[PDB]
Design a protein around this ligand. Structure first.
Ligand SMILES: O=P(O)(O)Oc1c2c(c(OP(=O)(O)O)c3c1[C@H]1C[C@@H]3c3cc4c(cc31)[C@H]1C[C@@H]4c3ccccc31)[C@H]1C[C@@H]2c2cc3c(cc21)[C@H]1C[C@@H]3c2ccccc21
Ligand SMILES: O=P(O)(O)Oc1c2c(c(OP(=O)(O)O)c3c1[C@H]1C[C@@H]3c3cc4c(cc31)[C@H]1C[C@@H]4c3ccccc31)[C@H]1C[C@@H]2c2cc3c(cc21)[C@H]1C[C@@H]3c2ccccc21
Ligand SMILES: O=P(O)(O)Oc1c2c(c(OP(=O)(O)O)c3c1[C@H]1C[C@@H]3c3cc4c(cc31)[C@H]1C[C@@H]4c3ccccc31)[C@H]1C[C@@H]2c2cc3c(cc21)[C@H]1C[C@@H]3c2ccccc21
Ligand SMILES: O=P(O)(O)Oc1c2c(c(OP(=O)(O)O)c3c1[C@H]1C[C@@H]3c3cc4c(cc31)[C@H]1C[C@@H]4c3ccccc31)[C@H]1C[C@@H]2c2cc3c(cc21)[C@H]1C[C@@H]3c2ccccc21
Lengths: 227, 17, 230, 17
C-alpha cells in the first residue's frame, strides 16, 4: 500500500499530473514512517510543481494589476486574491506535513536539513504574497528554518553535498528577494561556490551531476547580482 | 523583475526513468 | 456576469495559463446563446484545446508505460486503471465541447467561415474521442468525425479561398485524421498536397491580416506530406 | 515516430495577435 502509492506518484510524475502526485505522496507521509530519499524527492517535486503554477500565475497577474493605474484593476486584484488563496492553502498543506510528520521523524542529518530547507522555502513563498501585518513573522519563520538547516549543514555535510549547495542557493535567494540584501545573498552564494570548488575531489559519481549543476546556478546568481 | 520573472532558486531538475 | 466581464476574465486567465478558469468563462459566454465574435471563438478554442491537450499528452505517456510493462501484472494494471481515469476525464471534456457545438455554435453560425470553423472543431473533438475509443463505439465515433470534417471541407472548397487559414487548417487536421485514425497515409498525403498546391496556385488571394498564419500552415502541410511519404 | 511523446502534427493554437 505504501509501495502502491509511491508507484502511482511516479506514474503521475511521468504523466505531468502533479495534483495527483502530491495527493499520493501526501497520504504516504500521513502514514507516519520516515521517507526514503526517492520518496522525499517525489513529495517535493510534486508540491513544488503545484505551488509553482500559482507563483507563476500570481506574478503575471500582479504585473497586469500594476500597469492598469482602473476597473480592469479590480478584476486583476480579485483574480490575484483567488490565486493567493490557492497558494497559501498549498503552502500551509506542506508546512503541516513538515511540522506534524517529516521534521519530527528526521533521524539522519541530511533528512533534517532537507526538510528544514523545505520549511524555509514554503514560508518564503508565503512571504512573497504576504502584507506587512503578517509578513514580518512569516519571513522570520523562513529565516529561522533556513538558519537551522544552514548550521547543521555547515557541521555535518561536505561542501559539495547537493543538499548543502541547494540550501545555499535558496537561502541566498531569500536574502536577495525577501530581505533586500544583495551583499548577504552574494557572500552566501560565493562562499558555497568557493568551498565546493576547493574540495572537488570529494564528489561521488552518484551526485557529481547534481552538485556541479547547483554550483553553476550559484555562480549565475552571483554574476547577475554583482552587475 | 517583470511579470515573467523566475526566482533563480533550486529547480525540480535532473529526473529520469 | 455579463459577456464583457466573462470575456475579460478569460483573457486574464489565459495570461495566467489557468485554462480551466478560461474555459469555464467561455463556456458561460457561449451558454448565453448569442453568436460569438472571432475573438471569443478563438478564446473558447484555445481554452478547451489546452484542457483536452493535457489529457491527450498524459494518455500517450501512460499508454506507452502500460505497453512496456508486459509481464509485470501489478504495474500494468496500475497503468491501465490510470489510463482509464485519464480517458474519462478526456471524454467529459470532449462531450462538453461537442454539446456546445451542437446546441449553440453550429446552429447560430450565420456565416460560412463560422460554419467551417465550428464543423472543424466538431471533427477535431470526435477525433480526440476516437483516439481513446475501443470496441463498437470507435467506428461510430470515427464516422461522426469524418462527416463533420467532410461537411466543413465541402463548404470550405466552395466558400473560402485556398489560402484562408481555416481552409488550410481544416486540410491539415483532416489529413491527420486519415493518417492517425483511418490508417490511410496516401489519402492523407493527397489531401495535404492538394491543399498545399492550391494555396501555391493563388498566393495573390492572401490578405495582409493573415499571410503569416497561412504560410505557417502551408509549411506544416508539407512537413506532414514529406514525413509520411519518405 | 509514434511513441509516448509523439504529438499529432495537427494545427497549433498559436501566433496570437
Ligand atoms: O521597477 P521595476 O524594474 O519594475 O522592478 C521593481 C518593481 C517593484 C518593486 O517594489 P516591490 O518590492 O514593492 O515589489 C521593486 C522593483 C525593483 C525595486 C524594488 C525591488 C525589489 C527587489 C528586486 C527588484 C526591485 C529584486 C530584489 C527584490 C526582489 C524580490 C522579488 C524578485 C526580485 C527582486 C514593484 C513594481 C515592479 C514590480 C514587479 C512585480 C511586483 C512588484 C513590483 C510583483 C509582480 C512582479 C513581481 C515579480 C516577483 C515578485 C513579486 C512581483
Ligand atoms: O468604481 P470603479 O473602481 O472606478 O470601477 C467601476 C466602474 C463602473 C462599474 O460599474 P459598471 O458595471 O456599470 O461599469 C463598476 C466599477 C467596479 C464596480 C463595478 C464593477 C464591475 C466589474 C469590475 C469592477 C467594478 C471588474 C469585474 C466587473 C468588470 C467588468 C469588466 C472589467 C472589469 C470588471 C462604471 C464606472 C467605473 C467604470 C469604468 C469603465 C466602464 C464602466 C464603469 C466601462 C468603461 C470603463 C470600462 C472598463 C472595462 C469594461 C467596461 C468599462
Ligand atoms: O512501431 P513503433 O514505431 O514503436 O510505433 C507503433 C506503436 C504501436 C503501433 O500499434 P497500433 O497502431 O496498434 O497502436 C504501431 C506503431 C507503428 C505501427 C503501428 C502504427 C500505427 C500508426 C502509426 C504508426 C504505427 C501512425 C499511423 C497510425 C497512427 C496512429 C496514431 C498516431 C500515429 C500513427 C504501439 C506500440 C507503439 C505505440 C505507441 C503509442 C501507442 C501505441 C503503440 C499509444 C501510446 C503511443 C501513442 C501515440 C499516439 C496514439 C496512440 C498511442
Ligand atoms: O489495429 P487497426 O486500427 O484495426 O488496424 C490495423 C490492423 C492490422 C495491423 O497489423 P499489420 O501491421 O500486420 O497490418 C495494424 C493495424 C494498425 C496497427 C498495425 C498498423 C500498421 C500500419 C498502420 C496502421 C496499423 C499505418 C502505418 C502502417 C501502415 C501500413 C499501410 C497502411 C497504413 C499503415 C491487421 C488488423 C488490422 C488490419 C486490417 C487489414 C489488414 C491487416 C490488419 C489487411 C486487410 C486490411 C488491410 C488494409 C490494407 C493493407 C493490408 C490489410
Amino acid at each position: 500500500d505504501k509501495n502502491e502509492l509511491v508507484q502511482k506518484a511516479k506514474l503521475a510524475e511521468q504523466a505531468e499530473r502533479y495534483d495527483d502526485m502530491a495527493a499520493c505522496m501526501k497520504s504516504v507521509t500521513e502514514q507516519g514512517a520516515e521517507l526514503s530519499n526517492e520518496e522525499r524527492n517525489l513529495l517535493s517535486v510534486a508540491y513544488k510543481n503545484v505551488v509553482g503554477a500559482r507563483r507563476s500565475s500570481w506574478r503575471v497577474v500582479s504585473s497586469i494589476e500594476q500597469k492598469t493605474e482602473e476597473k480592469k484593476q479590480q478584476m486583476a486584484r480579485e483574480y490575484r486574491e483567488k490565486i493567493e488563496t490557492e497558494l497559501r492553502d498549498i503552502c500551509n498543506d506542506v508546512l503541516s506535513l513538515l511540522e506534524k510528520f517529516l521534521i519530527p521523524n528526521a533521524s539522519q542529518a541530511e533528512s533534517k536539513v532537507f526538510y528544514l530547507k523545505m520549511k524555509g522555502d514554503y514560508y518564503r513563498y508565503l512571504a512573497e504574497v504576504a502584507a506587512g501585518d503578517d509578513k514580518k513573522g512569516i519571513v522570520d519563520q523562513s529565516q529561522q528554518a533556513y538558519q537551522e538547516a544552514f548550521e547543521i549543514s555547515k557541521k555535518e555535510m561536505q561542501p559539495t553535498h547537493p543538499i548543502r549547495l541547494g540550501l545555499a542557493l535558496n537561502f541566498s535567494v531569500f536574502y536577495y528577494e525577501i530581505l533586500n540584501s544583495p551583499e548577504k545573498a552574494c557572500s552566501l552564494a560565493k562562499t558555497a561556490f568557493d568551498e565546493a570548488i576547493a574540495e572537488l575531489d570529494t564528489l561521488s559519481e552518484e551526485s557529481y551531476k547534481d552538485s556541479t549543476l547547483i554550483m553553476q546556478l550559484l555562480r549565475d546568481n552571483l554574476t547577475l547580482w554583482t552587475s | 523583475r517583470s511579470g515573467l520573472y523566475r526566482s533563480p532558486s533550486m529547480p525540480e531538475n535532473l529526473n529520469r526513468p
